[PDB]
DNA sequence: GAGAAGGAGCAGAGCG
DNA sequence: CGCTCTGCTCCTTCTCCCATCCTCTCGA
RNA sequence: CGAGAGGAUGCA
């Protein structure tokens, strides 16, 4: 993969446990094969 | 399910065709032993035209006037003409073409006149002509008895198999009679000296030349054929289709019966 | 990448028997096993460290032989042996002549 | 069975193939070369150059369905392809 | 007779969407369905029911039943089929491999 | 028996001192094909040579087993040698049997069959006296 | 005893010993291979008869690579013991248990369980022969021994060689 | 050890005394376990080895190079095979019950005739539609040649009972019927003449009737029913080590309700119990309802289950399988390419690798492609020494330092011209594979000639194909010989050319060789430029 | 839900 | 009339159906 | 680790 860290989030379920979810973002070029 | 019906049938060195066990299956690949890739259309000039037409297109006849070889085609002219010897080699040519026209015409019932054989003869006459500017105007150096023995010569050449026993060499006969009929139909002295008006040196150089052509299209052994036979069937078979399931599956509970009463 | 049994019948049409053995052997599956010659079946033990091998069952430290087969195969022949069937593998046609 | 060997005399494409790959694997170990290198480092064009002037020292042994065989060796059989 | 007419049925469906092959591959499958003395068909119930070896057979329709057929009867298979070498990863007799190549020592010794 | 030649050549009872003189001869054309490339002292010592100028010492075993060979050896003279072959074989004696009895010494048929269980039984007493007192007379000789 | 037996070995070559000179070159490997060999099926190999004239049977070039097999067909003496052998050996070394004798190339140990009830191993001796009874046997003297049969291992081969018998005594 | 090469397969049935003398151990517990360590009766040391353990019976290697041995387990009772039910059924059917004699003979003849078959499958075949429609097997029998005569053939000359299959059991329907006992029928087969093998179709050696029935399981080792540490070092063992441990425990109540005071009726359900499992372990995919379900609810897959059917061990694993030194992306065309040539994207051909071998032609340029090291496209990823030394250029600066030798192979990049093996899937027929002629380019996905598309039955609306590198020499000259592009430009499948000229240059030739085209003096220069087989004759 | 291999059952003509 | 025995028919019992990729998810 | 679902990929 490629990409910068776009938000973290860190929260915890019913039962106390912390949860942690990562989003990345990256730009996607038209390239030589991509299809349309 | 049909690449594993055929999956381990393949030519042996002996030109025959076997499975994994042995057992034969063809006793001469394609019953020509020729390989498929080097077969292309070419006519029968034989089968066609009125038995009159076929006559004036290879009958030649030195003594009489129906058919007489004009001395212009040849720096040889009356020394020909009036040459029993000669007629009589004329004679068995013709007769050897009328057997071919009467016995093709039990091969193809329906009289059809282009099938696939190996080796266009019709492009060697053509290269030899172009090769040095064949000149098309003026009397040949042929000579009968070499149009007739070169044909007899090469006949001796077309070799598919190699045994020395009757077994082997009665199907080595076989194996190429359909294509020497091709051969002595295009090939006949009329036509070599009209339509082909071939010198000495390039009928030496086509005799030549069509063997090694035949003998390069002779089936290689160790082809698998098994495998090609099945996808040479698989692909067509992605384009009738329920009836090809029909007939691989035996399914003696056909669709669509019917007869067909002459 | 998946060579399955479709791709394996073109190298066969088109006869190139050895690059077909490197893709089934030298891509992957390559293993090494000891055979007893009296009794076709992976049941050698194979000391290398010291060069010993023998044949529990058949008393037998002389007939061994390196084979060369898919780990699969191997696999294969084991699983069969658990369903008490008995692949017994020999290195010499039993018909001479 | 030398004598009055059955085999077609032409040497066929697989066999080709066969010599040329055995004869550049050879030679890519070292073995003997019998022919002056003009450059061609490539092995596989020096098996071919070996092939085209018959200098290949192999001898290939043809099976039939029964079990017996013929032996040829590759200056005898005429190249074509 | 029937090989003749089945060749002409098979040659119809193919010609019939206008494409054409060469007489030779349907020649060679009509043929096989007709080696064994009457029409074979080509399924699970046809060509696998061969005599032919066992470990071939295992691939095309039934494995695990074929193999208890095999080891009940004692079957041996001669290795001569394809598949077999590739189960076991040897060398199959065709094409390239249909045949053995050997060392001329006469001729290296001879050549100089 | 049968050979690799495909030649169904019977079991070779090759006998204790016609094998040493085999040796002897297979030690001499080795040294020959190197070169392209009598009373039991003088044979041991003799051997010795052949087997240090043919072979590479690496092997001491086969010198040892040929000294020791000599020591017993029963007919050294190989011209006497061929006596004995035909008058152990010409009788029809199993091979097995003939090399036991022109490789050990034996002097009464009793003997022989006392040495040699086989023979007890079906051997044929006569021979052995006329042979073995032959053979011990060649015995002797040496 | 000894035979003479045509015997087969496989010898594979690398490819750089794929010279004019291996002719005389195989042969050569041959015989460091088969020179020297302990064998259960045939005892111990001694020589290789017709050191020239060797069968090389044309060599199998492998498929994995450029080694070429070879099937090398030869005629070789060979050394069998049989049960129940007589043998006309001598002691190599002496042991309180017995003796150890030559038998051609094999080694045979004569066991005091198997040599004559009143012959009992004197240690006073030098060597510490057996002499309680006439049959005297050291390492020095000859010895006639009876082979029980073959006790075959990886590195050797060795039997038992008795002399409480009528026949095959002490020299 | 020797090197050889297998060249033919038999087959047969264990012998119960092979078994055991095979096995290098007994299996005795369920557990396979004071928290590491295995019970000696199951998955020990004597068997293959977990990781890091060089035991494997002594056999060290860990799993690298040693297999596993088998182990073996003594079942209390027989048990029927379930592949061999129907057959020991039919076989059952024919013999003499509690003679050892078929229940007819060669007096008949009909019975000549199908001894006289040659085929085995067919020669018991004929029979047993012969000997089933028997019902009695009378001692005297007239005989053909003296019907005044009979043979007193029939050791029981009695009758026999009708054979019905109940699930996993046979049951003896007798004319006048119970439950056949297993341990009977050994008794019968045992009974059995080697003669009566030949009619059979059994071999002395191979196939013996008594060893249809399962007197002891040989118990495959781990590598055949790998450990499983998918969690955190949670077994989740494979269904067979579960499935054996079921057995274990029914086999050992088998013979704990028979010592423990015989109680006759609970020694007959645990019978089937452990010939319930026995039968799922070997197939839990039967005709009749049982179905071993694993406690998680879904099914037990059963040897049959890994072996039978797609993707089983067969069609699976061995007629096809995951290659490496292999590439799949997208594909694209490209007018500029000659038709035994393909753009290869850079990046790829600096992962996949060929075995270059050092000799005195090219060592010049291995040194090279060494000092370039793996960063760079003309280079090479492994050194590796005649020892087996596969020097790792990615982690060392020796890149700089290596001196080659003779002999040792280079991991070199794939580079121009080297000959490669293309493929789409599915690979209908022959001309779906053919080799061409590596070119690098710089951009994520392969190229082509607009041409070659006609064979391949391609499309570059997104679709991909499998690229396949040979390793060896000899495979490069094999594939340059015979699957190259330009040797199958014409096929035998219709003795026609398979590919042409398509789309838009097709159309470019109808308009460039119309009648009335004509073309200017500075555009021809150009034109002319372009074929570069043009002999500069204007 | 579709087709092929198995097994059971009615059954009518020929022999005693 | 008595009894046999292959012929033909009426139910069961399974057995097999394009190759790839290429993912995310879910629950043991 | 298996199971499932989605998107497909290819037709005169
Ligand atoms: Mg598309
Ligand atoms: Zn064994
Ligand atoms: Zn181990
Ligand atoms: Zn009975």
Redesign the pocket.
Same mark, same amino acid.
């Given at each position: 993969e490629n990409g910068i860290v776009d938000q973290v989030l860190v929260t915890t379920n019913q039962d106390g446990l912390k949860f942690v979810k990562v989003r990345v973002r990256t730009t996607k070029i038209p390239q030589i094969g991509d299809?349309f | 399910r049909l690449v594993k019906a055929l999956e381990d049938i393949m030519v042996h060195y002996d030109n025959t065709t076997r499975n994994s066990l042995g057992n034969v299956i063809q006793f001469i690949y394609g019953e020509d032993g020729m390989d498929a890739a080097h077969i292309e259309k070419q006519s029968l000039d034989t089968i066609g035209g009125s038995d009159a037409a076929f006559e004036k297109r290879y009958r030649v006849d030195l003594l009489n006037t129906d058919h007489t070889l004009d001395p212009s085609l040849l720096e040889s002219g009356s020394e020909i003409l009036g040459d029993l010897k000669l007629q009589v080699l004329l004679d068995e040519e013709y007769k050897q073409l009328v057997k071919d026209r009467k016995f093709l015409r039990e091969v193809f019932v329906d009289g059809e006149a282009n099938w696939p054989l190996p080796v266009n003869i019709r492009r060697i006459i053509q290269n030899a002509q172009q090769t040095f500017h064949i000149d098309h105007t003026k009397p040949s150096d042929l000579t009968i008895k070499d149009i007739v023995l070169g044909v007899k010569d090469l006949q001796e050449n077309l070799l598919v198999l190699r045994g020395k026993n009757e077994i082997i060499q009665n199907a080595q006969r076989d194996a190429v009679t359909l294509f020497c009929c091709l051969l002595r139909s295009r090939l006949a002295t009329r036509r070599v000296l009209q339509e082909y008006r071939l010198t000495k040196q390039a009928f030496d150089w086509v005799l030549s030349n069509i063997e090694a052509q035949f003998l390069r299209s002779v089936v290689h052994p160790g082809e698998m054929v098994g495998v090609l036979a099945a996808q040479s069937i698989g692909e067509p078979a992605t384009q009738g289709v329920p009836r090809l399931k029909e007939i691989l599956?035996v399914?003696?509970?056909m669709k669509t019966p019917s007869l067909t009463v002459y | 990448?998946?060579?399955?049994?479709?791709?394996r019948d073109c190298m066969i049409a088109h006869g190139a028997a050895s690059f077909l053995k490197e893709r089934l052997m030298e891509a992957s599956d390559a293993f090494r096993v000891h055979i007893c010659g009296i009794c076709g079946l992976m049941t050698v033990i194979a000391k290398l460290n010291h060069n010993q091998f023998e044949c529990k069952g058949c008393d037998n430290k002389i007939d061994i032989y390196q084979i060369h087969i898919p780990y699969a195969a191997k696999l294969l022949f084991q699983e069969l042996m658990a369903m008490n069937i008995t692949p017994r593998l020999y290195t010499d046609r039993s018909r001479d002549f | 069975p030398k004598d009055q060997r059955a085999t077609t005399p032409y040497m066929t494409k697989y066999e080709r193939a066969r010599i040329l790959g055995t004869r550049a694997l050879q030679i890519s170990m070292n073995a003997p070369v019998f022919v002056d290198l003009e450059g061609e480092t490539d092995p596989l064009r020096i098996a071919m150059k070996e092939l085209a002037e018959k200098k290949i020292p192999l001898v290939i042994r043809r099976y039939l369905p029964d079990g017996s065989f013929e032996d040829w060796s590759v200056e005898e059989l005429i190249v074509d392809l | 007779a029937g090989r003749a007419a089945l060749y002409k049925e098979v040659y119809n469906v193919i010609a019939s969407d206008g494409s054409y092959v060469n007489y030779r591959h349907m020649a060679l499958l009509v043929d096989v369905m007709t080696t064994q003395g009457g029409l074979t068909s080509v399924?699970?119930?046809g060509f696998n029911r061969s005599n032919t070896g066992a470990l071939m057979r295992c691939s095309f !329709? !039934?494995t695990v !039943?074929i193999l208890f057929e095999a080891g009940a009867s004692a079957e041996l298979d001669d290795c001569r089929g394809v598949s077999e070498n590739v189960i076991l990863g040897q060398m199959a007799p065709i094409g390239t491999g249909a045949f053995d190549v050997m060392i001329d020592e006469e001729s290296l010794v001879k050549y100089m | 028996q049968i050979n690799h030649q495909g030649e169904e050549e019977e079991l070779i009872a090759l006998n204790l001192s016609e094998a040493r003189l085999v040796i002897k001869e297979a030690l001499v054309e080795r040294r020959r094909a190197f070169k392209r490339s009598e009373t039991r002292e003088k044979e041991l010592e003799s051997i010795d040579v052949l087997l240090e100028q043919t072979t590479g010492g690496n092997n001491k075993d086969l010198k040892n087993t040929m000294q020791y060979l000599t020591n017993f050896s029963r007919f050294r003279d190989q011209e006497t040698v061929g006596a004995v072959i035909q008058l152990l074989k010409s009788t029809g004696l199993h091979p097995f049997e003939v090399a036991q009895l022109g490789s050990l010494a034996c002097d009464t048929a009793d003997e022989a069959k006392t040495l040699i269980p086989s023979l007890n039984n079906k051997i044929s007493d006569d021979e052995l006296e006329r042979i073995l007192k032959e053979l011990s007379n060649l015995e002797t000789l040496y | 005893m000894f035979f003479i037996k045509d015997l087969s070995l496989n010898i594979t070559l690398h490819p750089s010993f794929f010279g004019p000179r291996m002719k005389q070159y195989l042969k050569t490997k041959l015989l460091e291979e088969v020179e020297g060999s302990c064998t259960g099926k045939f005892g111990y190999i001694l020589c290789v008869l017709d050191y020239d004239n060797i069968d090389i049977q044309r060599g199998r070039i492998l498929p994995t690579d450029g080694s070429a097999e070879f099937n090398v067909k030869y005629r070789a003496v060979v050394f069998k013991p049989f049960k129940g052998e007589v043998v006309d050996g001598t002691v190599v070394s002496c042991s309180q248990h017995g003796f150890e004798v030559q038998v051609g190339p094999m080694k045979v140990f004569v066991t005091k369980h198997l040599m004559p009830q009143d012959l009992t191993f004197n240690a006073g001796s030098n060597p510490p022969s057996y002499q309680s009874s006439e049959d005297v046997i050291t390492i020095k003297s000859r010895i006639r021994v009876k082979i029980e049969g073959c006790i075959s291992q990886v590195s050797s081969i060795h039997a038992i060689g008795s002399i409480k018998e009528d026949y095959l005594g002490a020299i | 050890a020797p090197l050889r090469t297998v060249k033919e397969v038999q087959f047969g049935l264990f012998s119960p005394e092979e078994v055991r003398a095979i096995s290098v151990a007994k299996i005795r517990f369920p557990e396979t376990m004071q928290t590491r360590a295995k019970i000696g009766g199951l998955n020990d040391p004597r068997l293959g080895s977990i990781d890091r353990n060089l035991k494997c019976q002594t056999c060290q290697e860990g799993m690298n190079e040693c297999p596993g041995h088998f182990g073996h387990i003594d079942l209390a009772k027989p048990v029927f095979h379930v592949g061999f039910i129907a057959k020991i059924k039919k076989v059952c059917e024919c013999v003499c019950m509690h003679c050892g004699k078929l229940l007819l003979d060669e007096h008949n003849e009909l019975m000549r005739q199908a001894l006289a078959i040659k085929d085995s499958k067919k020669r018991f075949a004929a029979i047993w539609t012969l000997c089933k429609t028997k019902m009695v097997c009378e001692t005297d029998v007239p005989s053909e040649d003296d019907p005044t005569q009979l043979v007193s053939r029939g050791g029981c000359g009695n009758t026999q009972p009708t054979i019905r299959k109940d699930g996993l059991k046979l049951v003896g329907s007798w004319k006048k019927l119970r439950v056949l006992s297993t341990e009977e029928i050994l008794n019968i087969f045992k009974h059995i003449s080697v003669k009566d093998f030949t009619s059979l179709g059994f071999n002395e050696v191979f196939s013996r009737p008594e060893w249809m029935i399962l007197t002891c399981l040989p118990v495959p080792p781990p590598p055949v029913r790998p450990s499983?540490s998918?969690?955190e070092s949670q077994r989740?063992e494979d269904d067979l080590t579960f499935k054996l441990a079921d057995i274990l425990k029914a086999n050992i109540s088998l013979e704990t309700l028979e010592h423990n005071g015989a109680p006759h009726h609970a020694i007959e359900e645990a019978e089937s119990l452990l010939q319930f499992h026995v039968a799922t372990y070997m197939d839990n995919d039967i005709?009749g309802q049982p179905q071993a379900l694993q406690?998680?609810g879904?099914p037990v897959k059963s040897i049959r289950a890994r072996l039978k059917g797609?993707e089983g061990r067969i069609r699976g694993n061995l007629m096809?399988k995951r290659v490496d030194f292999s590439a799949?992306?997208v594909i694209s065309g490209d007018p500029n390419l000659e038709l035994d040539q393909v753009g290869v994207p850079k990046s790829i051909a600096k992962t996949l690798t060929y075995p270059e071998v050092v000799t005195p032609y090219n060592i010049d340029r291995l040194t090279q492609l060494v000092r370039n090291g793996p960063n760079e496209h003309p280079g090479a990823k492994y050194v590796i020494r005649d020892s087996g030394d596969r020097i790792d250029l990615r982690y060392s600066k020796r890149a700089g330092d290596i001196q080659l030798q003779y002999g040792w192979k280079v991991e070199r990049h794939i580079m121009d011209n080297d000959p490669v093996l293309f493929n789409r899937?599915?690979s209908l027929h022959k001309m779906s594979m053919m080799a061409h002629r590596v070119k690098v380019i710089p951009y994520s996905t392969f190229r082509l000639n607009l041409s070659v598309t006609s064979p391949y039955?391609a499309?570059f609306?997104?679709?991909?194909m499998n690229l396949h590198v040979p390793q060896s020499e000899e495979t490069r000259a094999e594939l340059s010989q015979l699957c190259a592009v330009p040797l199958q430009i014409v096929s035998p499948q219709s003795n026609k050319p398979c590919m042409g000229i398509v789309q838009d240059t097709l159309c470019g030739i109808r308009k460039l060789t119309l009648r009335d085209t004509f073309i200017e003096l500075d555009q021809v220069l150009n034109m002319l430029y372009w074929v570069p087989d043009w002999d500069g004759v204007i």
């Open positions: 299809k | 599956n399914a003696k509970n | 990448l998946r060579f399955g049994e479709m791709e | - | 399924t699970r119930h !329709e !039934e !039943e | - | - | 499983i998918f969690n989740g005709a406690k998680s879904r797609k096809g799949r992306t899937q599915p039955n499309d609306d997104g679709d991909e």
